[PDB]
Design a protein around this ligand. Sequence first.
Ligand SMILES: CC(=O)N[C@H]1[C@@H](O[C@@H](CC(=O)O)C(=O)O)O[C@H](CO)[C@@H](O)[C@@H]1O
Ligand SMILES: CC(=O)N[C@H]1[C@@H](O[C@@H](CC(=O)O)C(=O)O)O[C@H](CO)[C@@H](O)[C@@H]1O
Ligand SMILES: O=c1ccn([C@@H]2O[C@H](COP(=O)(O)O)[C@@H](O)[C@H]2O)c(=O)[nH]1
Lengths: 361, 361
Amino acid sequence: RKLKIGITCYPSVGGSGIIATELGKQLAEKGHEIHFITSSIPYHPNIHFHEVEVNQYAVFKYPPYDLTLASKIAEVAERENLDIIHAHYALPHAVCAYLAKQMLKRNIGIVTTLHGTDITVLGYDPSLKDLIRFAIESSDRVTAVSSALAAETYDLIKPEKKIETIYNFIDNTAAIKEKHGILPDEKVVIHVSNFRKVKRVQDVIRVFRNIAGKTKAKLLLVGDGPEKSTACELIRKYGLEDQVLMLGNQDRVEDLYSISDLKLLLSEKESFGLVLLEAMACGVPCIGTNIGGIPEVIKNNVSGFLVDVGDVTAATARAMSILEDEQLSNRFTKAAIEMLENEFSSKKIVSQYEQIYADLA
Amino acid sequence: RKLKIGITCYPSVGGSGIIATELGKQLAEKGHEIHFITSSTYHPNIHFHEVEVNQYAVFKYPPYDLTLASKIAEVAERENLDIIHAHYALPHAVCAYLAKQMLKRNIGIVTTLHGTDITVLGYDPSLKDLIRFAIESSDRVTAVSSALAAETYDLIKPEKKIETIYNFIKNTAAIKEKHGILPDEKVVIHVSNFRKVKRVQDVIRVFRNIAGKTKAKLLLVGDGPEKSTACELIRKYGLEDQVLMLGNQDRVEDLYSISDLKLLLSEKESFGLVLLEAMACGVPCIGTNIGGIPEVIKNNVSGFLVDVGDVTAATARAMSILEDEQLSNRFTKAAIEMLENEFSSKKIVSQYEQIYADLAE
Ligand SMILES: CC(=O)N[C@H]1[C@@H](O[C@@H](CC(=O)O)C(=O)O)O[C@H](CO)[C@@H](O)[C@@H]1O
Ligand SMILES: CC(=O)N[C@H]1[C@@H](O[C@@H](CC(=O)O)C(=O)O)O[C@H](CO)[C@@H](O)[C@@H]1O
Ligand SMILES: O=c1ccn([C@@H]2O[C@H](COP(=O)(O)O)[C@@H](O)[C@H]2O)c(=O)[nH]1
């Protein structure tokens, strides 16, 4: 049964944005009518974009994006007769969905997906606890991208609400290596992140120093963010400028995972770690920290390795085990691919979102 | 029975900011407990609570509406507020509504319209339903004039009673000396925010005719976007030496005290708080025949009213006042008795108190 589904999110912060957009693309492919309600964007015929323009109107001291977004949700809900609004993030989107629902004369189902950013915000301003709780409680169905995010939510927010785990999902290496001046005999390590402190790039670099000081190696650092200059400085301090490619942000990140032999994600906080799936899909074995959602993706000594937060020497050892032992590497990669094709497959995950919409319609 | 009353507003935009803070000052004196909740000597029963809006790398816009709602809820619960009194439908009534859906308690929401919601709506017609929802989700709604009540009903159509409750309110040789005004100059004053709706260009033209018929100074008091337009027009008519651009001011009372005539020739004006100030200081007023201005000025009794844009009639009215001391003192006397009756703080504060009393129990 074809539904009309509104989706309200920030179209791209890194991981979440990609997930919401991708999810909309896959529902479109299944014949559903999808209506993104977002800030202006720069596609399938069943996907439509509605833009929220915020103005100050010379009355408002701060631009009222929340209220403007609520308004626009309600307007679209009504004109297009939406069955669902799917909000990504409790704040602001789930509260806006709620406001839009109270404006509408019609009932409409609200689904909210927590990606982790409500926990982050709560760390900056714990007084938002009640508002986040309300937003969760006022949704019809609430999902989280990991069981560990869900548990953390229950712990800090304590809502009277079942939070269901629905995981994230994902959609010529000689030439690419050549483009990037990587030689046939260099081992390629990759790290993709938004360079925030919680990512601990400094740990990624200390591990890579250890690596490149044993075998011959190149590090691909992909992304941009606040701790970039901390990264460079540390690259220069250790003398690794020839051996590291600061690629900034990238498109064609699949090209970069395709040429890599090892993926490091050594975060102190991580609700899921979408970058792990992408590397797994490209047959790149992973080491991650044993926090947050990471151990729901990497199964230790089965699909990759897990290490303690900050444990550089343990991650080095794991890293070499993998870089030398082609047999270990291949068994990891193959175990990872099996996860992709079952638990993390877009077909299974899009159907779990879809079952929620049908429940509510 | 003393009550605990939260007040959410922008604490000194201009008129509304003055009203909301004086109202709280006056309720404090009668022994109510007043909690201002805003983005920021005083009576001991007045308390201030500040909201801090931050993005935290998560939000694209700082969510002031959501943070404000969250702070109202928090103060409401901690202090057992009986009442939240919001000034402006947007954002404050909606923030108060949100705070009230968050509270385990019931709380009375009082919303006062000042006319900004009409301004917002002219700029963005799609916010109609939101403004309507904000009005209908308040428990009681007031408006600063019957003209605003009526225009609100005609433009927004809320199913909600809007009650009219009005706004409420020496060594001149030294002052005139200080501003270089000589003893034989007539002084005309205009106090506004220099928005386009104030028609400062009509005030200046009228002044221009006056100044060609008698020795005159014009005090233009305040700041805003059309200030530079005003300046230019002054230059064009050659009046630089006859006009004082005082910019924003405190002790506006000093300036009224040296003035013989006040012009308010707006094309939109819900109430016109500046008329009451000028009346209290013994200055006769000419206003346009719109919005609330006629609820304040009685034509030929306590000032004159003219049509919007009618420079000829304003000039002729201005000359009749500046030439006839008898007329002027009759206007000024009559104006002052209106102030003691219709626009007294004792009367208006008690009207607000009665609303609060109806809502608490
Ligand atoms: C810090 C954190 O929890 N980040 C999660 C979070 O990342 C955020 C961005 C961020 O907060 O760094 C996002 O992409 O919206 O959600 C991702 C997608 O669901 C997860 O894969 C990330 O692990
Ligand atoms: C243009 C307009 O309607 N202004 C009203 C409005 O003024 C606004 C400022 C403005 O938008 O001009 C305010 O001060 O909040 O509210 C005042 C207080 O009730 C009224 O005296 C003004 O007449
Ligand atoms: O330069 C970059 C940095 C990050 N990403 C993408 O941002 C997302 C980060 O998700 P997560 O690891 O925060 O969950 C991934 O899809 C990743 O490929 C890029 O496309 N280019």
